[PDB]
């Protein structure tokens, strides 16, 4: 129920399902962006995953245990978005991040645009470690999207 990997986050009522996001299972903990689940519980097969840690300002939440993803963008190298878009299999997209310059420091940011239900897809370093999650960002003047590389603290 908590096997390592990337997962779709789905919702259903009485009819079909909608993909609202994506997340990462690592070390028994499920990691996603807060705006995907609004911090509500998740079903995994016949099991229930309860929220454990989260932070709306970071737009992150973890289930079953504390945040486990510790790898950091090195501030230099190309990265890969492992995008899991609604209705499409996972795909890797390589990019050189730009930068969100904030009063509190710089954050890597990727100029890659996917449907909203791709939120929570992991961004990877060359060793395959998850350096953050995709899906909290800004829309620039021409309507295109730039996502922070959002990482928590382990």
């Amino acid at each position: 129920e908590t096997t390592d990997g990337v997962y779709r986050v789905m919702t259903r009522r009485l009819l079909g399902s909608t993909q609202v996001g994506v997340g990462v299972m690592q070390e028994g903990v499920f990691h996603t962006m807060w705006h995907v689940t609004k911090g509500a519980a998740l079903r995994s097969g016949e099991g229930r995953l309860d929220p454990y840690w989260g932070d709306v300002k970071q737009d992150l939440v973890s289930y079953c245990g504390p945040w486990k993803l510790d790898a950091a963008w090195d501030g230099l190298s190309e990265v890969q978005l492992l995008a899991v878009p609604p209705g499409e299999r996972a795909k890797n997209i390589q990019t050189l991040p730009g930068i969100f310059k904030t009063k509190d420091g710089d954050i890597g940011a990727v100029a890659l645009d996917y449907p909203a239900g791709t939120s929570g897809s992991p961004i990877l370093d060359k060793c395959g470690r998850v350096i953050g999650l995709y899906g909290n960002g800004v829309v620039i003047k021409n309507g295109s999207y730039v996502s922070a590389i959002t990482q928590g603290k382990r």
Partner: protein, 40 residues
Amino acid sequence: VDMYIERAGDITWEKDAEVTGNSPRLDVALDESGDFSLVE
């Protein structure tokens, strides 16, 4: 509302991947509710 998860793959770097996107340098602000906004 039934919110549930389903496995979608392994987490692996792809060798010889397609490279796309620019590297924008943007001034942003982050509010207490987690919204990023461009500084105008």
